Design a protein around this ligand. Sequence first.
Ligand SMILES: Nc1ncnc2[nH]cnc12
Ligand SMILES: Nc1ncnc2[nH]cnc12
Ligand SMILES: [Mg+2]
Ligand SMILES: [Mg+2]
Lengths: 254, 254
Amino acid sequence: ETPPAGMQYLYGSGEASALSLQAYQALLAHVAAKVKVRPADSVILAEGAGLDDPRFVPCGAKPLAAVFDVDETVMLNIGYEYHAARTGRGFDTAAWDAWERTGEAAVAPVPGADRMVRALRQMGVTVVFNTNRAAGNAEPTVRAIKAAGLGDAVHGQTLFLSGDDAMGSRKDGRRATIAARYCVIAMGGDQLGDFSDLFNGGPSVTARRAATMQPAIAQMWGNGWFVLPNPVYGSGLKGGFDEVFPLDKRWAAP
Amino acid sequence: ETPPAGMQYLYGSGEASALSLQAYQALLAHVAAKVKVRPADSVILAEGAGLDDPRFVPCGAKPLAAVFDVDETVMLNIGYEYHAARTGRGFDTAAWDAWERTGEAAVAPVPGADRMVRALRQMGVTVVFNTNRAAGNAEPTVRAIKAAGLGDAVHGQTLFLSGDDAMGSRKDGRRATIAARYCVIAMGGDQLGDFSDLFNGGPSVTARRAATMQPAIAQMWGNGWFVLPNPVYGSGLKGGFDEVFPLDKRWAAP
Ligand SMILES: Nc1ncnc2[nH]cnc12
Ligand SMILES: Nc1ncnc2[nH]cnc12
Ligand SMILES: [Mg+2]
Ligand SMILES: [Mg+2]
């Protein structure tokens, strides 16, 4: 038996490896330019700014930082997805809670994520993690991040988890806390919720894809917001046939 | 019924859209820097240069150009993959040959690929396509490229297809022809064979992934070689369990 195709790609292929290394290379070059010249806008949206008319929290004189999602952005959850491939039970809240507590032995860095995290700190940029892992599992998450070669994270200062506020999986509140004390010059993630909660909680698969091509949002990709692949799970694996294949681009073999 | 997960991601998700827009943004910024200052090395490997010790064809005073694979790099083959999702017969040489001849009506641009192709030509950079589509289907391929908003391609000058030499799917010979008359400052692709044939024809899934992290090769991603996602088909969807999930990163739920 062979693993699911999405796992073959993300965890096995050199295509996905080069895809990840490219994103970090662009991130390191973008941060370096912002270290030499501090911008006026940070890369975190201001509160009340919709996807229709985007506006950002100002940078000011706050310390420079970069926000990262953890799972499948800087850290590969190889151990859990191996269990998902063996079982088929990918969506399991009880199994994932155990993985958050006992998975520090089976984690790997996204290709180049350990190298960029060191470069960001040698550049004087603080590395902040904003993950939907549970606040109750903060200590095993810190150990897993350390075991992935991603440095030392501290709960409340450089690590913000689900449950730190009364908003659940919504990360806008935690992004507001980070931007209130840091000037975030770059933000990485593998799901659109890692850049704005406005991509989720309503918009359809067709609407979310169009939202990324909003010219004010489109200018962010590779230029402030940095994306990494995840065809294994999450909000990217949704939609039926009429949403994946538009009816004006359909074809039948003879 | 829902389409395969990889197709949900690549063709439906906004995550894959932002992933593609990021790659082109980095490509446009890289090309602009090379227009202001022409480099000494092009991004095409010299003949006889192995992945162990990489070396590149010099740039010289040749016209600046950028090489692109077509399928799932600049053009989405929505119509064919819709047929693959309906049928399950993804690997079909007879059906794909028909798609090369009759698919110009069901193609779309990769997000931002039509915008970058115009920007490259407004910058004075020639856009060259190196695809494994058949040379016998060059004219319907030209029409499909045009229908995707990717400009005008010419067979033999800006379009090089499988069969133009006696090497089949190997693209190194066609890359040698392009680099002999152009200074290629950027090259995009969704499979590793779009950058060097040395990634294929032998190396295992584990070996190919490690090859992308060769420091001389690793410096190219997002900095000369630009990658786009394809978890739907190709050399990225290979390998068994021992190659996707290394044995030191395995885990079992309680
Ligand atoms: N339930 C889940 N939670 C988080 N990541 C996952 N990946 C696959 N299933 C998951
Ligand atoms: N046989 C094939 N040739 C090219 N692209 C494909 N995508 C899926 N199957 C394919
Ligand atoms: Mg994640
Ligand atoms: Mg291709």
